[PDB]
Amino acid sequence: AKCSKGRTASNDACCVWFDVLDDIQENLFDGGECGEEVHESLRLTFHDAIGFSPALTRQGKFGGGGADGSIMLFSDIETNFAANNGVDDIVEQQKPIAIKHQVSFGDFIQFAGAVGSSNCAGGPRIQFLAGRSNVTKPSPDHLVPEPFDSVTSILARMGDAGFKPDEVVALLASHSVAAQDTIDPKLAGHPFDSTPSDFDSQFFVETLLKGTLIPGDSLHKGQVKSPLPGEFRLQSDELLARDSRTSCEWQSFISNPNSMVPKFERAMAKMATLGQNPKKLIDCSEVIPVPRGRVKQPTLPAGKTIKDIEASCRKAPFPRLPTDKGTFTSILPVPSS
Ligand code: HEM
Numbered sequence: 001a002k003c004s005k006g007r008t009a010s011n012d013a014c015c016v017w018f019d020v021l022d023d024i025q026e027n028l029f030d031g032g033e034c035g036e037e038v039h040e041s042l043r044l045t046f047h048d049a050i051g052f053s054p055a056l057t058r059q060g061k062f063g064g065g066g067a068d069g070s071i072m073l074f075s076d077i078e079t080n081f082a083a084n085n086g087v088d089d090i091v092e093q094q095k096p097i098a099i100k101h102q103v104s105f106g107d108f109i110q111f112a113g114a115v116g117s118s119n120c121a122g123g124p125r126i127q128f129l130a131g132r133s134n135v136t137k138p139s140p141d142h143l144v145p146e147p148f149d150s151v152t153s154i155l156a157r158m159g160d161a162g163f164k165p166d167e168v169v170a171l172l173a174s175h176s177v178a179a180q181d182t183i184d185p186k187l188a189g190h191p192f193d194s195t196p197s198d199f200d201s202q203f204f205v206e207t208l209l210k211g212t213l214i215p216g217d218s219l220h221k222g223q224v225k226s227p228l229p230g231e232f233r234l235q236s237d238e239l240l241a242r243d244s245r246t247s248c249e250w251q252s253f254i255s256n257p258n259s260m261v262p263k264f265e266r267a268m269a270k271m272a273t274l275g276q277n278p279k280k281l282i283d284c285s286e287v288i289p290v291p292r293g294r295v296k297q298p299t300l301p302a303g304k305t306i307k308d309i310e311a312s313c314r315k316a317p318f319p320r321l322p323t324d325k326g327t328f329t330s331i332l333p334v335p336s337s
Pocket residue numbers: 036038039040042043045046086145146147148154168171172174175177178179180181182183184222234236
């Protein structure tokens with residue numbers, strides 16, 4: 001079928017997504033940038049989708065509808081869940097965009113995440129399926145993992161939703177393009193790695209460094225010491241990098257950086273369709289832009305050495321990496337407005 005601006009798609013019902021693409025790229029994402037709005041949009045895909053629990057369903061309780069737009073339609077309820085702190089900003093920005101284009105909240109949330117991530121240097125090109133219904137119910141509370149949850153708790157929660165430990169690690173490649181706002185509000189915008197617009201392996205490297213710094217006046221719930229000026233570290237990321245259930249796969253994205261994009265893409269296709277049947281949706285994947293940027297060689301930060309890495313994979317040593325020359329420059333906070 002013929003879409004706008006000389007574009008085409010096998011399925012006429014994908015054509016609307018080209019118009020949503022143009023709008024969110026030019027406006028929400030300020031000209032195709034991998035900045036704040038993209039980071040928030042990518043986080044939102046998880047906070048919508050993870051509200052899904054077969055365990056609750058089998059005990060005769062509502063388990064959540066997964067990737068169903070519930071966090072948006074029922075934003076009054078869901079954004080007041082503790083685990084959903086700092087989410088309403090992006091939800092209230094996206095809501096009128098989805099309404100104006102008359103696309104479903106669930107589809108829009110996943111679309112904004114897929115388009116957004118494709119703008120990041122070396123980013124993924126996530127599968128995009130359309131057709132999720134708005135008719136659903138608010139997610140139960142306590143289904144979103146928290147940064148102070150144990151690795152046992154996180155893996156069990158993610159396992160219930162459908163993800164193996166390796167897949168949890170893959171999904172956390174998202175933290176390569178990511179900052180915090182609510183754990184330590186005064187340090188809003190301090191990112192989880194040195195390259196928050198580059199979909200690279202620096203997150204996996206830098207979380208394995210020894211925690212040495214309290215960046216603000218104190219530590220806060222869900223935070224641990226960071227290894228570099230300007231960086232923020234989550235307690236969960238630190239535990240996951242070191243825990244024997246996950247440490248080898250954590251290190252695998254450093255030993256084999258080319259695997260990060262394909263494994264993230266596969267895990268995200270799954271997460272974006274929680275509570276849905278793909279065979280009853282339509283495939284509009286071709287609307288997602290092709291990402292640009294080569295796979296980067298992960299490097300140790302300036303002034304750090306291999307002694308600063310807390311290597312945690314029993315079966316295989318940490319890979320030999322180059323070390324950046326000179327002294328370390330504080331990592332810039334992510335802009336936002
Ligand atoms: C597995 C357990 C996870 C935990 C405990 C966790 C925890 C967190 C926390 C505490 C923040 C900072 C929130 C704030 O204070 O502003 C954050 C940010 C973020 N999360 Fe995760 N997360 C998890 C998994 C994921 C997944 C699966 C995704 C998506 C694939 C994701 C995407 C993001 C992104 C893109 C940000 C940055 C948001 C921004 O820049 O404002 N996270 N996460």
